[PDB]
Design a protein around this ligand. Sequence first.
Ligand SMILES: */C(=C/S(=O)(=O)CCCNC(=O)CCNC(=O)[C@H](O)C(C)(C)CO[PH](*)(O)O)CCC
Ligand SMILES: */C(=C/S(=O)(=O)CCCNC(=O)CCNC(=O)[C@H](O)C(C)(C)CO[PH](*)(O)O)CCC
Ligand SMILES: */C(=C/S(=O)(=O)CCCNC(=O)CCNC(=O)[C@H](O)C(C)(C)CO[PH](*)(O)O)CCC
Ligand SMILES: */C(=C/S(=O)(=O)CCCNC(=O)CCNC(=O)[C@H](O)C(C)(C)CO[PH](*)(O)O)CCC
Ligand SMILES: */C(=C/S(=O)(=O)CCCNC(=O)CCNC(=O)[C@H](O)C(C)(C)CO[PH](*)(O)O)CCC
Ligand SMILES: */C(=C/S(=O)(=O)CCCNC(=O)CCNC(=O)[C@H](O)C(C)(C)CO[PH](*)(O)O)CCC
Lengths: 73, 72, 70, 75, 77, 76, 146, 146, 144, 145, 146, 144
Amino acid sequence: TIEERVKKIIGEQLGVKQEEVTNNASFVEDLGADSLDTVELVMALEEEFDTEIPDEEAEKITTVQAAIDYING
Amino acid sequence: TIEERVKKIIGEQLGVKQEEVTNNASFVEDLGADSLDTVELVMALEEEFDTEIPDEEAEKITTVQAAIDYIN
Amino acid sequence: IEERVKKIIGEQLGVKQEEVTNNASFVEDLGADSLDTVELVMALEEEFDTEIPDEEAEKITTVQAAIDYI
Amino acid sequence: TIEERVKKIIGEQLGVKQEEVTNNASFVEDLGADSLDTVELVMALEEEFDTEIPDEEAEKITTVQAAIDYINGHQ
Amino acid sequence: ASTIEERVKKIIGEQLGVKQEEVTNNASFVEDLGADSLDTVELVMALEEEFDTEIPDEEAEKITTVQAAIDYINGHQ
Amino acid sequence: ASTIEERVKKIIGEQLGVKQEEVTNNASFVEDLGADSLDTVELVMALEEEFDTEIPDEEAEKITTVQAAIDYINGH
Amino acid sequence: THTLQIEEILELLPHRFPFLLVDRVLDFEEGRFLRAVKNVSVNEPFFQGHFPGKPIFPGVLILEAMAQATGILAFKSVGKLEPGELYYFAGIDEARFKRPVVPGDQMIMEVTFEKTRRGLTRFKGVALVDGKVVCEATMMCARSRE
Amino acid sequence: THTLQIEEILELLPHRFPFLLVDRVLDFEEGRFLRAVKNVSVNEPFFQGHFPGKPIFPGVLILEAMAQATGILAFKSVGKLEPGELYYFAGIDEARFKRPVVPGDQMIMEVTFEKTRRGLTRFKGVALVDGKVVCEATMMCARSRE
Amino acid sequence: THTLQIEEILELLPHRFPFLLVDRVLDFEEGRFLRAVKNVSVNEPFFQGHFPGKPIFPGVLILEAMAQATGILAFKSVGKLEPGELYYFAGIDEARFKRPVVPGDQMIMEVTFEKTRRGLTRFKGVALVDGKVVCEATMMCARS
Amino acid sequence: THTLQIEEILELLPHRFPFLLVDRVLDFEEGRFLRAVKNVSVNEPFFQGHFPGKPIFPGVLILEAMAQATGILAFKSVGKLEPGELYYFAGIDEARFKRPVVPGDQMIMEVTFEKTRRGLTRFKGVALVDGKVVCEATMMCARSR
Amino acid sequence: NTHTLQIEEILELLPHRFPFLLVDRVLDFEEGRFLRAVKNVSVNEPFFQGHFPGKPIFPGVLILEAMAQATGILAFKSVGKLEPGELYYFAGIDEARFKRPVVPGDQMIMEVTFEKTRRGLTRFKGVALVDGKVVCEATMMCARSR
Amino acid sequence: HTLQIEEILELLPHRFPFLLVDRVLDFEEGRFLRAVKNVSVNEPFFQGHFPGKPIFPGVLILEAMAQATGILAFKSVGKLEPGELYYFAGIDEARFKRPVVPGDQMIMEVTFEKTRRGLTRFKGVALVDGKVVCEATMMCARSR
Ligand SMILES: */C(=C/S(=O)(=O)CCCNC(=O)CCNC(=O)[C@H](O)C(C)(C)CO[PH](*)(O)O)CCC
Ligand SMILES: */C(=C/S(=O)(=O)CCCNC(=O)CCNC(=O)[C@H](O)C(C)(C)CO[PH](*)(O)O)CCC
Ligand SMILES: */C(=C/S(=O)(=O)CCCNC(=O)CCNC(=O)[C@H](O)C(C)(C)CO[PH](*)(O)O)CCC
Ligand SMILES: */C(=C/S(=O)(=O)CCCNC(=O)CCNC(=O)[C@H](O)C(C)(C)CO[PH](*)(O)O)CCC
Ligand SMILES: */C(=C/S(=O)(=O)CCCNC(=O)CCNC(=O)[C@H](O)C(C)(C)CO[PH](*)(O)O)CCC
Ligand SMILES: */C(=C/S(=O)(=O)CCCNC(=O)CCNC(=O)[C@H](O)C(C)(C)CO[PH](*)(O)O)CCC
């Protein structure tokens, strides 16, 4: 389903074990974020689930839960 | 829920809209397929369904219907 | 004499003596760039061991003017 | 005549005045031609006198007189 | 005054940077002494120039201890 | 016999390309004979090969004139 | 038009021999796309090393050429590279090599901007020879100060 | 381990200067994985062209180095290169550049076999420096004669 | 068609990097003429040395490129190069450089056979960029 | 531990491609020693020329890398090059090449100051690969003109 | 006595750099009159690995380039040096003959003599000798313009 | 007797950019060899060692002398059979006395001293215009 794919993407894009990617892991704080891994990750999500995310909408994705919530819309 | 996933895979691999992926569409002629898109698509089907597709058997999957039939 | 002048023009601008007429201009007619005119001033001067000022040389653009200065 | 033209070609090829080019002066020894001047001058003779000189025949042309003799022969 | 094997031991000590006490008749160049494959050849040449003797290549291969060098030098063979 | 001074002046002239007439006893290598930093090193090594000796660094620093080299070779 | 010769390219890109891989800019529209040309000659250094005897332009160098073309488009769209600013290759996503590029070929590259966010830009690149697609990729390049 | 020095690599790969980018092979298990080393020195030619003054190993060259490592693995697993045979990049997916590689770095590449079909083979590559990942990619490589 | 790709050119010419300057042969008629292509890229080594900062293709390299095309034409018309055989540049006449050649240019060279005597062969060459003549020269090449 | 990356080296040494042969500096003490690293890769230009087919790092380039290391040490211990000053390799002595260095090797060099007399400086250099001594030499470098 | 120019003065006069700087020394010259220069032919020059590998012979077109650079030095010394925005062009060649092959180890002595100059365009005659024997001679025209 | 660059190519395995002997002027088997290295500004290392002040690196004088001793050895004791290497084993007493600059013609004289078990000691002197610019004692080995 959708959370399997989102957590898979977040784990592959950021070099973290799938075990560490919890629903509320912050990309910057909890997981390893370079200056632009958040942008890379949003673009990765976008390419996998063929969706388009506006800039203001993309700025809102800072946690795993936020990503899972957006994919429902 | 087999053909939903098969058509999902074909749409993802061959950059075509799900409406254009009909049961009777050939990969090469109707859709646009690189000699490498067929191989990637076979590998993607295997990765999604964790099954083994022989080379002689894989060469026969040239249409969407053939793929779904091999799966079933 | 002008036979020699026309010989020089033909050799300098790679054209047959048949096509180099008295009233033919160097730049457009015989397709000469900024260097064929100077090479030809040099070739004429060396042939007729004469000195041509640049302002005087600037006016020589046809075979007619060339022999007339000559 | 034929000697003016032959002498003009040789004098121009080896940068010498028409006075220094006598009929039986050899190109290599007397006038200083190099292995490439002999060939260029044979081509020049061919271009001026619309005749063709075979390779061995070009080998024999070493003086002005030899060229004039070849030209008068193969009219 | 005069000296005999003393000169061989002196040369070996100079070539392999060791104090002369370490040079024993039963010392091997490689194992006991800190000698590589190239110091051995330099040492045979140094011996050859000191005693103005000829050590053929086949003969030189056998000089691997202090005793062997002293023995070859005794009698130039 | 060849005097220690003959030998030393011979070497200095060959090493520094100077006429043997110009190499005097109180001539400084650097000023008088115009030697660079590496001519001094080669010059000490030439002395070492000539008299079959080894000159330690502390003594070598003192050899800066012809007289110093002769003195070193023959006892204070 | 909006063509660019090599002198302006040199003023825009910091790359030099043997790693400058854009020979000319045929056209561009700011913030949207850019069309550039890489001339493939046998007198280039890598051809003596990669499969000597069978000269074929390396595909990863097609990718580098497309990245340099987006660099030109970005510097013309957002501003030139300031002192201490670097332009980084951040990612590649679906590069496909469809036809070999050989000496004598004139490779036309077209880069099209998709999105830009915090100096990182996603673009789509297409390389063509004689109107036939020879390579296509989706890439992301970033601008950063350290 | 099954190590391979530079002479053996030269006999397996046809690449030569300036495009041979595998210095040593540390270990491999046939048909599974291969671990190789690329030494990054400032004395390499591309460093005079890519950002002169700020030497950083270009990412596309990390990709090529991984591709050559997959070449060694393939030659040892399936069979060496026949004369009229080429080994070429068919595609690249999911390429991520995480850390710049600089002179003095010893880049260890590990390539792992995934799938093969019709002579096309998928590998996954990871490039590390001091145990930290600097690059990772998925590649598709093909071999064919002429 | 009598086109020649880079592999046939390598089989015909001994020139290699960095002095092989013929990338393709578009056409030729044996003993008459040959049309070839030189692609001018900024990624060529001489550009880092000749006026660094002002990349312009050197004229002497235009002449060498035409001379190599004449080599191709001669090997196709008279026979390939035997081992004990050299192909020499003997001379230049009336060479004119009319327009500068820059990176991005695709230079078309056309060489035409004029005359032959002994081992010497005279050719006339013209180089074009975008249909405009950038250079023209008369050359003489000698065999072995 | 006082390391120096390639940017600091570029600021200290004037050598550029293809004759810059120090990739990193692991440690150094002013007037005493410097330890540097040369990464040996097969993608270096001399490898297409010295014995093509059997790539082995030339010994004279090991000596040049040690000389550049002493150059760094001197610029750090005394001033860097003032206008007109050059740094010269003046001499080599007691040099031995003990083990061949091949591509894939990381050569660690330690250069140590011995004696100084007016700009002329004697150094001891030792080069190691994987804990084995590969080269050792006595060098002398001068600052002049 | 004599008026030489070392490689530092040549670097300040000519803009050419590696690998297209072809004048190693100037032995003599008299402003606006003639210049005698030296090109050392070594096997360690880059073109020798490409033009007829195995039979190294100095290319004749490079003799012509060497004469042109000697003339450039003479011109810059007689008239002003190259100002910003000035180019020094090869305009044309007449009557160039290659008489003897030049090989590694040879020291080619070039002498250029100015014939005539007007409007910045200059005709000179060049002669190249090895061991007192003439290997090349040409009449060339070089122009300086903007 | 002299050796041109073709004979040198047949004797030494070194190639660009690390072949540093341009000619052999004279030699005697087992005693001495005189060779020539032409120093031109068109050599690749000159763009790297002190850009702007071209001076021939001293270690390259040493390498050129070692290659000269290599030629002497191959002519005195026999050529390199396949599988043999000619190694630089040691250097003693090297002095760089005068800088060598572009335009200089460096004449090298290598003199055979001694041989023992494939190790050979030579003395080399390099001169420019008759003045000594470098001198060294070298040891080269043949093995494997
Ligand atoms: C770059 C080049 S180099 O160091 O290798 C120079 C090549 C060899 N060096 C020389 O030629 C030095 C010769 N000159 C001298 O002898 C000095 O002037 C001396 C006399 C040594 C100065 O002595 P004192 O005046 O200090 C450098 C790469 C590391
Ligand atoms: C030359 C080289 S390159 O562009 O190919 C760079 C080589 C590969 N790129 C990287 O190594 C990118 C590494 N990524 C980072 O350093 C950070 O994630 C960045 C993107 C720098 C963000 O840092 P933040 O502090 O801003 C040029 C080729 C065109
Ligand atoms: C050197 C470099 S390289 O690997 O980067 C070459 C990259 C160029 N790649 C290509 O040209 C790929 C060409 N693709 C094909 O032709 C494939 O066979 C495809 C398109 C997959 C055909 O599919 P189907 O007919 O099997 C190495 C150069 C040899
Ligand atoms: C090419 C390179 S080189 O001459 O510069 C050689 C590089 C340095 N030479 C060495 O590495 C010599 C190492 N020594 C050995 O390995 C020998 O086999 C020794 C140790 C001398 C013999 O020991 P024993 O076991 O026989 C060529 C330039 C001319
Ligand atoms: C580097 C290159 S080069 O100059 O040798 C090669 C350039 C050769 N091409 C040209 O010379 C372009 C020719 N341009 C002209 O001569 C125009 O006719 C001029 C005279 C410039 C303009 O004519 P008019 O319109 O003013 C240099 C190495 C030395
Ligand atoms: C590579 C170089 S090149 O040919 O362009 C450069 C060679 C320059 N030309 C020559 O060396 C010719 C000089 N030698 C001669 O002139 C012949 O020996 C002559 C005299 C013509 C023979 O005639 P005669 O002596 O029998 C090649 C690229 C194409």
